[PDB]
Coordinates of C-alpha atoms and ligand atoms in Angstrom, one line a residue:
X1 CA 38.4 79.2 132.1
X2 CA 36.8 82.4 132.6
X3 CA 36.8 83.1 136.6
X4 CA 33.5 84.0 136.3
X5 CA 31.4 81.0 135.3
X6 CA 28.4 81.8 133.0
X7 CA 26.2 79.1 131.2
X8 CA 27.0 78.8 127.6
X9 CA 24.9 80.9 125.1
X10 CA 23.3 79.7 122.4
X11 CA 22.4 82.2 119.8
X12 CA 19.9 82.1 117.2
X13 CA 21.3 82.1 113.8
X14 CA 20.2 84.0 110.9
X15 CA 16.3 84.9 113.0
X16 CA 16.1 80.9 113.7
X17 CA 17.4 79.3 116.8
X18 CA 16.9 75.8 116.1
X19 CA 18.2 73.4 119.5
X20 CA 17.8 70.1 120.2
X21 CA 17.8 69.4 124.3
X22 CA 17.4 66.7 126.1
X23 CA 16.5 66.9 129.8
X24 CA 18.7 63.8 131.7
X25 CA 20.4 63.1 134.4
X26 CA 24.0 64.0 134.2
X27 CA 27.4 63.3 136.3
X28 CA 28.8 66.9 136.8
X29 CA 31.3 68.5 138.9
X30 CA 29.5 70.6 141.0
X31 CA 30.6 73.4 143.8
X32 CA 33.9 71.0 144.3
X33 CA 32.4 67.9 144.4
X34 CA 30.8 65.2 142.0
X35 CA 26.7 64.9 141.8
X36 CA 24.2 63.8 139.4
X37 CA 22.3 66.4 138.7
X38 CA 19.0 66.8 136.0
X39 CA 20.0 68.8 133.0
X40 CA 19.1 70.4 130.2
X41 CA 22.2 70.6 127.3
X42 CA 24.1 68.5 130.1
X43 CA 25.1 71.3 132.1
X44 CA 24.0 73.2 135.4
X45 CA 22.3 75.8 134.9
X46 CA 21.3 75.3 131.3
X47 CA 22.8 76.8 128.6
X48 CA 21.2 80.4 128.1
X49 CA 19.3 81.3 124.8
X50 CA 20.1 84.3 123.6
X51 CA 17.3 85.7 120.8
X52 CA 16.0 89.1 119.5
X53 CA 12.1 89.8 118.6
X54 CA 10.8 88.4 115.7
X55 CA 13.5 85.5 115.9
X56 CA 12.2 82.1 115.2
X57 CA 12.6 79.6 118.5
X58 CA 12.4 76.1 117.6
X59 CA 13.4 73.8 120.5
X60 CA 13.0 70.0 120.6
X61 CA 13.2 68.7 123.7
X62 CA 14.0 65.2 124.5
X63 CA 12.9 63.5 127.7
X64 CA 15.5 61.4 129.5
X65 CA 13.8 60.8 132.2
X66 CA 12.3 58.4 134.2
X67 CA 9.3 60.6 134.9
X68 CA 7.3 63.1 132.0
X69 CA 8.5 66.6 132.0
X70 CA 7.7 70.0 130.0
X71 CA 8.5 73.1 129.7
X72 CA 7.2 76.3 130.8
X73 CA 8.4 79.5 128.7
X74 CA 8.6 81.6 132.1
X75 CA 7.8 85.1 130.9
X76 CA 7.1 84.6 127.7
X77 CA 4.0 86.4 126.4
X78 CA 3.2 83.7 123.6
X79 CA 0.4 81.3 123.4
X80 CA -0.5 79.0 126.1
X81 CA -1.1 76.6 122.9
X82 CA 2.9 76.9 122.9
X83 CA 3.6 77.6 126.4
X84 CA 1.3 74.6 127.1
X85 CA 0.9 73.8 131.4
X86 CA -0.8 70.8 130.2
X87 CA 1.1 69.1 128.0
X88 CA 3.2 66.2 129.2
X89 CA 6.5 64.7 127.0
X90 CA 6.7 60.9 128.5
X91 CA 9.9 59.4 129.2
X92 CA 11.6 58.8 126.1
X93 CA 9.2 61.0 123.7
X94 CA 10.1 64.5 122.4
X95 CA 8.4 67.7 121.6
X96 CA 9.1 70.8 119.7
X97 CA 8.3 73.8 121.0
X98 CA 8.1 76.8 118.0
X99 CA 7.2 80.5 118.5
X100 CA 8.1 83.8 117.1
X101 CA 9.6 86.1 119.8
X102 CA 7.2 89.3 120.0
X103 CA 8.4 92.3 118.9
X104 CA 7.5 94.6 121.5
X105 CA 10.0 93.0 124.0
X106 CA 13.3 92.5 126.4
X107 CA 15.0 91.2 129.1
X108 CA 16.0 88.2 131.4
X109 CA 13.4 85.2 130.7
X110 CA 13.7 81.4 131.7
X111 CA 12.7 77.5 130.9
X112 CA 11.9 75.0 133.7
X113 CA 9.4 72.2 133.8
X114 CA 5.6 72.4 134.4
X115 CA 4.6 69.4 135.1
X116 CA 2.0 69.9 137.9
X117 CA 2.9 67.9 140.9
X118 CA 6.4 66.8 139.4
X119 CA 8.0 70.7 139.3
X120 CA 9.3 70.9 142.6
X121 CA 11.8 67.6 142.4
X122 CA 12.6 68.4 138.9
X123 CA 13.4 72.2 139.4
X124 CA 15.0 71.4 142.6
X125 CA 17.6 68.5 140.8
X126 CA 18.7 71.3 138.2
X127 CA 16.5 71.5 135.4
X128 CA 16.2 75.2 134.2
X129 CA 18.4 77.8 132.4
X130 CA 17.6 81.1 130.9
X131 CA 16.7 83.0 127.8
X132 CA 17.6 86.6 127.1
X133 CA 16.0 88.8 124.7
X134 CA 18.4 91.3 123.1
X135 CA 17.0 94.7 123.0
X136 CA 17.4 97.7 120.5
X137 CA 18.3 99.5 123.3
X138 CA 21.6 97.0 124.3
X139 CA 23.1 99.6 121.7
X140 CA 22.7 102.9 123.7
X141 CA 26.4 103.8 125.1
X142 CA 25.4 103.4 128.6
X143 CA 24.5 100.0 128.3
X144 CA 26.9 98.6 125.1
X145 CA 29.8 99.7 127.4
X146 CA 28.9 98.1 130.6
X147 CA 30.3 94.6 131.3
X148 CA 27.5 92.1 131.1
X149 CA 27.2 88.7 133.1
X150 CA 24.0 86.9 133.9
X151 CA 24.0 85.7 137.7
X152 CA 21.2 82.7 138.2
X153 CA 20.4 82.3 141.6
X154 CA 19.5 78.7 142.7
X155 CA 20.7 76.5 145.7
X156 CA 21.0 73.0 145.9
X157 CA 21.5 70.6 148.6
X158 CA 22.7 67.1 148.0
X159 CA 22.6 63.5 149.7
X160 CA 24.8 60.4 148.1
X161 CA 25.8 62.3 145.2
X162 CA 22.3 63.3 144.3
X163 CA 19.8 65.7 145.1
X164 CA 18.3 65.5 148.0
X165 CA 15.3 64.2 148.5
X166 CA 11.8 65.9 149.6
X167 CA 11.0 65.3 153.2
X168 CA 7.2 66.5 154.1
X169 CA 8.4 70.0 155.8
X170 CA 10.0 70.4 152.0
X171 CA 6.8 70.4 150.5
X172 CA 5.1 72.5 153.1
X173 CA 7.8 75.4 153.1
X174 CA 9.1 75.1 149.6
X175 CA 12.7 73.1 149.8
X176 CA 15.9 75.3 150.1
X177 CA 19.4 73.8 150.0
X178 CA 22.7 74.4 152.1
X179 CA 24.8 75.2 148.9
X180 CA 23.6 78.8 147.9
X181 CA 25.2 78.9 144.4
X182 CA 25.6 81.5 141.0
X183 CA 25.8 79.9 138.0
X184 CA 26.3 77.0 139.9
X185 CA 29.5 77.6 141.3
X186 CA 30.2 78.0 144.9
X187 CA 30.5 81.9 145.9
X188 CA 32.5 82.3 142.3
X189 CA 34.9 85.4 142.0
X190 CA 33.9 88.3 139.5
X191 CA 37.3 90.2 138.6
X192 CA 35.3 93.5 136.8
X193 CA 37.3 94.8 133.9
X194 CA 34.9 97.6 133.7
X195 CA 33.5 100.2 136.2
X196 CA 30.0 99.7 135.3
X197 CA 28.8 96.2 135.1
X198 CA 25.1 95.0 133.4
X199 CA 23.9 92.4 135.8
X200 CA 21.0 90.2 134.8
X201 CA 19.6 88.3 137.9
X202 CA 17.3 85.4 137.9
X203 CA 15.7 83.5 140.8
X204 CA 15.6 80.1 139.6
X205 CA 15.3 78.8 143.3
X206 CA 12.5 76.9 144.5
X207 CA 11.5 78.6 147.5
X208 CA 14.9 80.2 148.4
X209 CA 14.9 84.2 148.4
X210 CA 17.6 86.4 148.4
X211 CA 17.7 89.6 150.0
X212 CA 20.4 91.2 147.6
X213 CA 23.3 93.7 148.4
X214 CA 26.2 94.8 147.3
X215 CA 28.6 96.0 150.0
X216 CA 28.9 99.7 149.9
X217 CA 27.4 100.0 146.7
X218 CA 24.0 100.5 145.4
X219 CA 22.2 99.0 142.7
X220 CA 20.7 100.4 139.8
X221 CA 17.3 98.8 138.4
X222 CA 16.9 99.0 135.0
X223 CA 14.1 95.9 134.1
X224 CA 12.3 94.2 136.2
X225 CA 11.0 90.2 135.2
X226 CA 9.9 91.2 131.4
X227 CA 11.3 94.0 130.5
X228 CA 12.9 97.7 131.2
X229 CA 11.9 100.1 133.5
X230 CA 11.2 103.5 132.3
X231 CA 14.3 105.1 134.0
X232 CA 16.9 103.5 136.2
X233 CA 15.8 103.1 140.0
X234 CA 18.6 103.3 143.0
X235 CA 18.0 101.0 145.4
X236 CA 20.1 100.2 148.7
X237 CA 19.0 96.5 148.2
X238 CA 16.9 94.5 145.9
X239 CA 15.1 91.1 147.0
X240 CA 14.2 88.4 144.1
X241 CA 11.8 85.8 145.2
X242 CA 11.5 82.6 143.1
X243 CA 10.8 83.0 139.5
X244 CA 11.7 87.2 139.8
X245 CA 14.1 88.3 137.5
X246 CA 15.7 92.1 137.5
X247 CA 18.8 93.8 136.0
X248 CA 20.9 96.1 137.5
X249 CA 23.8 98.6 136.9
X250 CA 26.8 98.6 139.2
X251 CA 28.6 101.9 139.4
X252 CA 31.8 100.7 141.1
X253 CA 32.8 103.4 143.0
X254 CA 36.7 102.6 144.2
X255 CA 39.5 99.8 144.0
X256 CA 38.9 96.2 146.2
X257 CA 36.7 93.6 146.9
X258 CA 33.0 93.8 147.1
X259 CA 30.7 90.9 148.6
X260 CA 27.1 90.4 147.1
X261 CA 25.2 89.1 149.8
X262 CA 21.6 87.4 150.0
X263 CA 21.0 88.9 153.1
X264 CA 18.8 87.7 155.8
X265 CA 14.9 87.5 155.2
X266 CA 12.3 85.7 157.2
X267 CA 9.7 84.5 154.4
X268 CA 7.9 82.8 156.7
X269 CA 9.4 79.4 156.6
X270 CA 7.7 77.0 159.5
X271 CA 9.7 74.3 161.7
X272 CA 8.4 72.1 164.5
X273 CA 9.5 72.2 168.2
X274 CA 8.3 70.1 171.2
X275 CA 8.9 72.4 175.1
X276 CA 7.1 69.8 176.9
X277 CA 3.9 68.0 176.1
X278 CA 2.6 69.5 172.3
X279 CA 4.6 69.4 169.6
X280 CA 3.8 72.8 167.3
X281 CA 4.8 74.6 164.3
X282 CA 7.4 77.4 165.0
X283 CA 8.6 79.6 162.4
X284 CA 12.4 79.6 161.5
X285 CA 13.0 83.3 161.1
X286 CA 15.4 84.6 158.8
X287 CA 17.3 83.0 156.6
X288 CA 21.4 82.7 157.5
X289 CA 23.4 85.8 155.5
X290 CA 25.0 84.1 152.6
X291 CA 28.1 85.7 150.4
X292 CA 27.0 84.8 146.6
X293 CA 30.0 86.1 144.9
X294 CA 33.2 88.4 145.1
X295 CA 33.3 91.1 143.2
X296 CA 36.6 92.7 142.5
X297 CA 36.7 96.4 140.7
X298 CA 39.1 97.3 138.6
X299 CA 42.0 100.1 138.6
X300 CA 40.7 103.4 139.6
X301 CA 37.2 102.4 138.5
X302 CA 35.1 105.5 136.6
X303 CA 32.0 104.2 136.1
X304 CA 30.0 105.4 132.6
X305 CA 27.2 108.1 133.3
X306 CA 23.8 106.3 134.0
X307 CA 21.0 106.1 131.0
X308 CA 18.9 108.7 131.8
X309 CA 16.1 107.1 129.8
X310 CA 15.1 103.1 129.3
X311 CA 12.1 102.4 127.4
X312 CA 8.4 104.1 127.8
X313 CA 6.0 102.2 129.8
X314 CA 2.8 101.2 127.3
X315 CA -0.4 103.6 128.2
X316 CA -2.9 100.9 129.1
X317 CA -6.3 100.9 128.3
X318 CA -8.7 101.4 131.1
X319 CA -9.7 98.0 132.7
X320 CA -13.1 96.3 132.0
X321 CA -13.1 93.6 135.4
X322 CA -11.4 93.5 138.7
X323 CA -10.9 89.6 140.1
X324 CA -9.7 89.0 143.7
X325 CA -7.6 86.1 144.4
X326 CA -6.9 85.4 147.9
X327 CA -4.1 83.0 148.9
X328 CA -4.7 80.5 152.2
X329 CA -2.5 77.8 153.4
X330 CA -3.1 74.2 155.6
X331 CA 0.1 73.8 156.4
X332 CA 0.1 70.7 158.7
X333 CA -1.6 69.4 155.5
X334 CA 1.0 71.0 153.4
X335 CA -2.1 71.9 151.0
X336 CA -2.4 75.7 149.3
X337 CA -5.2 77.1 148.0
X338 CA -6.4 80.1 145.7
X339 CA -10.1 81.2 146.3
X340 CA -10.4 78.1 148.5
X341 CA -9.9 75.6 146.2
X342 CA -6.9 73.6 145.1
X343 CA -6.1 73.5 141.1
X344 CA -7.8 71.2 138.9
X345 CA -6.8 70.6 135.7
X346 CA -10.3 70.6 134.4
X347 CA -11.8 73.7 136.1
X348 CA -11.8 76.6 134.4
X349 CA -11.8 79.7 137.5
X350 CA -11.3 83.1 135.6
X351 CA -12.8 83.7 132.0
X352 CA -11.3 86.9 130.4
X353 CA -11.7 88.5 127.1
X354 CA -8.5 89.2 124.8
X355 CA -7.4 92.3 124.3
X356 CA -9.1 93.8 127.2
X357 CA -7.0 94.8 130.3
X358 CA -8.2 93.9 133.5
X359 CA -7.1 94.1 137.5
X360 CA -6.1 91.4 139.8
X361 CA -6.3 92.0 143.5
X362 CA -4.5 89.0 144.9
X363 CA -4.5 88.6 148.7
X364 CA -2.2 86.9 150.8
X365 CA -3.9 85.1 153.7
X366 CA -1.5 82.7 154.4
X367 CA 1.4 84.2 156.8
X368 CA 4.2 82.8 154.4
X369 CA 5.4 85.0 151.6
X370 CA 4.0 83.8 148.1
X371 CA 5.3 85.1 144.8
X372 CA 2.2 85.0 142.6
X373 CA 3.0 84.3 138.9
X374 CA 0.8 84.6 136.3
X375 CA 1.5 82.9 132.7
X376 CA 1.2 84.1 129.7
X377 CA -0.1 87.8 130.3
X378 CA 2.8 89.8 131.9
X379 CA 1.5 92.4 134.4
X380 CA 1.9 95.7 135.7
X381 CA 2.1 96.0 139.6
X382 CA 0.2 99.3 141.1
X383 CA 0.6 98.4 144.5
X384 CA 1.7 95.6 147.0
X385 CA 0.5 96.2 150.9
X386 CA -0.8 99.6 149.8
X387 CA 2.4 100.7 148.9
X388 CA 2.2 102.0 145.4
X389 CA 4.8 100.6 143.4
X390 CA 7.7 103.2 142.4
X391 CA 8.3 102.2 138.9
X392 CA 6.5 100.9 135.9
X393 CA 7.7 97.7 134.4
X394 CA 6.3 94.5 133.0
X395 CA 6.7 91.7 136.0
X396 CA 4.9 88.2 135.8
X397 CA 6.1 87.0 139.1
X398 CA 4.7 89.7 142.4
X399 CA 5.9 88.5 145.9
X400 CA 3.3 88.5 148.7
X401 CA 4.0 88.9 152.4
X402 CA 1.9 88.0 155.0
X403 CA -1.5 89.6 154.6
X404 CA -0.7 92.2 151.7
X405 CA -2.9 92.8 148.8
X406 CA -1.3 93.3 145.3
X407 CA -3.1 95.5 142.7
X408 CA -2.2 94.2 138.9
X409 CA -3.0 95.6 135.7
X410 CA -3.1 92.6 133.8
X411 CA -3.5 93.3 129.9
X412 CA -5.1 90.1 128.5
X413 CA -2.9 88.6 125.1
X414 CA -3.1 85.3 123.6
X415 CA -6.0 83.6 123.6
X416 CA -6.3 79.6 125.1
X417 CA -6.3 78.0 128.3
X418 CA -3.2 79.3 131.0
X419 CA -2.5 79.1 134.8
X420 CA -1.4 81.5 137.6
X421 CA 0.4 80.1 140.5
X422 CA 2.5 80.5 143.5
X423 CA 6.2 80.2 142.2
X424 CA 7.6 78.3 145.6
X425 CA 6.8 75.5 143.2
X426 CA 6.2 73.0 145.8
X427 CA 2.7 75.5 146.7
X428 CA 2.1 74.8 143.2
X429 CA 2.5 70.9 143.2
X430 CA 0.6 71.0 146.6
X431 CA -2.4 72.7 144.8
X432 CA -2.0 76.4 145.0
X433 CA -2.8 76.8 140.9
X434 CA -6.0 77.9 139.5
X435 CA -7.1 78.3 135.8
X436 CA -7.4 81.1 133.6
X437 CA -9.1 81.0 130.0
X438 CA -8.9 83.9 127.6
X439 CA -11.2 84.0 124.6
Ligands
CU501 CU1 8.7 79.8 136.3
CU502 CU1 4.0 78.1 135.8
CU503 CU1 3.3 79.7 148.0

């Protein structure tokens, strides 16, 4: 097949895409070896949706598992009454999810379960895959003549041909796995045909983050999680936490091979060490450099002339309320916390008013790094550890170090009941959730 492996795409058809999945557990060939793995479409990842605004979704999903399961429409600015963190699809039962996708809208999104308490052994197994909206602005030269691929990022690790299981420091640190993996393969080999390639990158991870670069090459930013930025940004390296989702331009600059590498990054992660007498937490540092694929350019590469324009930012109305949500951890407890509290199902904790814009201050207290994602309402970040952000885009997923403070702009849409959460989803089994309600 193609040497670079991509999911399948599934396109809607004449405005409807109309999919039956069922979420199961599936005997795969995986990074060399043979596993059963959860899957949606029986594959790993699963297969990506491809849609344009004002296309017609409808997706039944079948449960095949032992255990209930949803899905979460990550990104998706639609109603929580479709997006629903509550609803629960017992084994054996189905549900069909139907929305219109809005118009005003592009980029790299993704499905995964939301089952609070059951996300983080369900994500982790290989239940997720991605949906891209197709943009009016795919069409501009820039873009229509790059080479495309989309690059999900998510590792696994594996025990008896299985996933392996959740030991107690898993659900305190958010569990990370020994095969770091695109697409599911094991570092894959991209053979560009063209100079300028159109990389859409998803973190579908559980707690995993990778610190990306391209050897001797920059990247280009041109979206961030839900949609363009209004110009392309160079950056030297580009880190995704779990849930994130950015697309870049490379500009291959001359002949050979390129690694992209998730490069060392100390989020924070704690392990346990006994020098005589007490037995402590320690933290683990940085990650181990991993390669994530090969990237090959082509015969005396001249890379197109970058878009000098993406799409205008929306002027936002001025903000009627400013919440503060500060992030603690208990982590010999392995229990999170927003506000001090754990979620609830049945406790509302912020009560906003649709249409109205309004700005989130969330605090990190905690000294691991937690990407905050909010449903339902994407965002605008101002700032994160008083650094004022240096691009406007919509993002639903902002990443916390240790004791920063992000500002969000956070334009209230559909009305209903929706949750924010950290995105290492184990956090958000372990309680760090809270409730918003729009009305
Ligand atoms: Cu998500
Ligand atoms: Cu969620
Ligand atoms: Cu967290």
């Amino acid at each position: 097949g193609p040497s670079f492996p991509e999911p399948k795409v599934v396109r809607s058809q004449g405005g409807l895409l109309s999919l039956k999945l069922s979420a199961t557990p599936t005997p795969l060939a995986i990074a060399g070896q043979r596993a059963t793995l959860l899957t949606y479409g029986g594959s790993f990842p699963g297969p990506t949706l491809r849609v344009r605004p004002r296309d017609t979704v409808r997706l039944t999903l079948e449960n095949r598992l032992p255990e209930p399961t949803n899905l979460h429409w990550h990104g998706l600015p639609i109603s929580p009454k479709v997006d629903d963190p509550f609803l629960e699809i017992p084994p054996g039962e189905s549900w069909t999810y139907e929305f219109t996708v809005p118009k005003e809208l592009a980029g790299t999104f993704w499905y995964h379960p939301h089952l609070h308490g059951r996300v983080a052994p369900q994500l982790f197994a290989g239940l997720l895959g991605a949906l891209v909206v197709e943009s009016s602005l795919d069409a501009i030269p820039e873009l229509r003549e790059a080479e495309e691929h989309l690059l999900v990022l998510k590792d696994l690790a594996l025990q008896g041909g299985r996933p392996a299981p959740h030991t107690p420091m898993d659900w305190m640190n958010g569990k990370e796995g020994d095969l770091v993996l695109v697409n599911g393969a094991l570092r894959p080999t991209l053979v560009a045909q063209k100079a300028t390639l159109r990389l859409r990158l998803l973190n579908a991870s559980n707690a995993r983050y990778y610190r990306l670069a391209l050897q001797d090459h920059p990247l280009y930013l041109i979206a961030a999680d839900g949609g363009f930025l209004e110009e392309p940004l160079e950056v030297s390296e580009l880190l995704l936490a779990p849930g994130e989702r950015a697309e870049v331009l490379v500009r291959l600059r001359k002949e050979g091979r390129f690694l992209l590498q998730a490069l060392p990054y100390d989020r924070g992660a704690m392990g346990m060490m006994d020098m005589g007498g007490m037995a402590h937490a320690m933290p683990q540092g940085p990650s181990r450099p991993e390669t994530l694929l090969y990237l090959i350019a082509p015969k005396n590469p001249k890379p197109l002339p970058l878009p000098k324009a993406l799409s205008p930012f929306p002027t936002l109305p001025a903000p009627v309320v400013t919440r503060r949500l500060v992030l603690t951890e208990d982590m010999m407890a392995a229990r999170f916390f927003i506000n001090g509290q754990v979620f609830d199902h049945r406790r509302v904790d912020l009560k906003g008013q649709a249409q109205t814009v309004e700005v989130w201050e969330v605090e990190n207290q905690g000294d691991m790094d937690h990407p905050f994602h909010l449903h339902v309402h994407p965002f605008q970040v101002l700032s994160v550890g008083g650094r004022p952000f240096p691009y406007r885009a919509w993002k639903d997923v902002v990443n916390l170090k240790a004791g920063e403070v992000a500002r969000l702009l956070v334009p209230l849409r559909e009305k209903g009941r929706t949750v924010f959460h950290c995105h290492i989803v184990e956090h958000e089994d372990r309680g760090m959730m809270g409730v918003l309600e729009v009305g």
